[PDB]
Amino acid sequence: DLFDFELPERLIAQVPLEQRDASRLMVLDKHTGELTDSSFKHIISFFNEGDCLVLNNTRVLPARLFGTKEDTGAKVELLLLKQETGDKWETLAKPAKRVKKGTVVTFGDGRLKAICTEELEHGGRKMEFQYDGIFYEVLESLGEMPLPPYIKEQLDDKEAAAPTAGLHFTEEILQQLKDKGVQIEFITLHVGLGTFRMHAEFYQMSEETAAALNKVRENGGRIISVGTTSTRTLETIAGEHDGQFKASSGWTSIFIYPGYEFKAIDGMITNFHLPKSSLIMLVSALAGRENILRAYNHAVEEEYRFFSFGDAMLI
């Protein structure tokens, strides 16, 4: 194989040195292929002003409502993605097929129902809630409301941990970078959602976030993704708009590999990976298969910790 090398199961960090910024930092020059070393404290010494960091920030926030298809029999699960205007929301629905045109779904005793004001491209569904009083209150209400048997039976119950090399980010460094003049933007990615369409991630970029990144691109700043993964979201987005960012959400399945021309990031921050997984190819497409390779060889040499909790890399 072409993305293989010697990787001592030992050089593979069993657990993390999460104590601090210790975690070394292999720095590779995308173009030149140079390959210096370092530690994650000096990090901030590589970012200029007008640079932005996109953080794959995650939130167990997909709140979900268990309603029942009004008219017909029943059973509809809604995943609340983002509230738009007033009482309209971006949503994912179980038994999606069931939710159509302007279908109506009831929740609980009927306080709060919702109509499907439209089908969405990513298979989601824009819905609109009907209710009295304060919305956020009504929900909270249903919060403590057990699922009626009717549904309850139709189910199996009642009513992880953000990986991403983006953890080496001491609240402090976050501040430093701010202070120095490096912006920080967030993207949102969800995992178990696949079952709402397969096992793809669901991303969401905001109007402001998109806006922000475009400025940076305009003003000639650099964009660096802090995401063993999020780099793909970005890449996906700017991919479908020609290097430009737009608010959006959807399923990400892009598979980056040598040859791919990045149109989103200028550099990224992740870890070292296995002698053939599909991450090395990603990275490899970024700085070239060779450069990365030799760096992988020198990383092993200077006994760098590889993978999940090992040391951090940058471009």
Curated annotation (Swiss-Prot):
- The record's principal subcellular location, in a coarse class, is cytoplasm
Keyword rRNA processing on this protein?
no
- Which terms under GO biological process does the entry name? queuosine biosynthetic process; tRNA wobble guanine modification
Protein's pathway? tRNA modification; tRNA-queuosine biosynthesis
Q: One GO molecular function term?
A: S-adenosylmethionine:tRNA ribosyltransferase-isomerase activity
Q: What class of enzyme is it?
A: transferase
EC numbers listed for it are: 2.4.99.17
Domain of life (superkingdom): Bacteria
Q: Which UniProt keywords apply?
A: Cytoplasm, Queuosine biosynthesis, S-adenosyl-L-methionine, Transferase
Q: Does the keyword Membrane apply?
A: no
According to its UniProt record, where is this protein located?
A: Cytoplasm
Task: Give the matching Pfam families.
Answer: Queuosine_synth
- Subunit description: Monomer.
Concerning its family, UniProt says:
Belongs to the QueA family.
**What protein am I looking at?**
S-adenosylmethionine:tRNA ribosyltransferase-isomerase
Q: Which organism is it from?
A: Bacillus subtilis (strain 168)
Gene behind this chain? queA
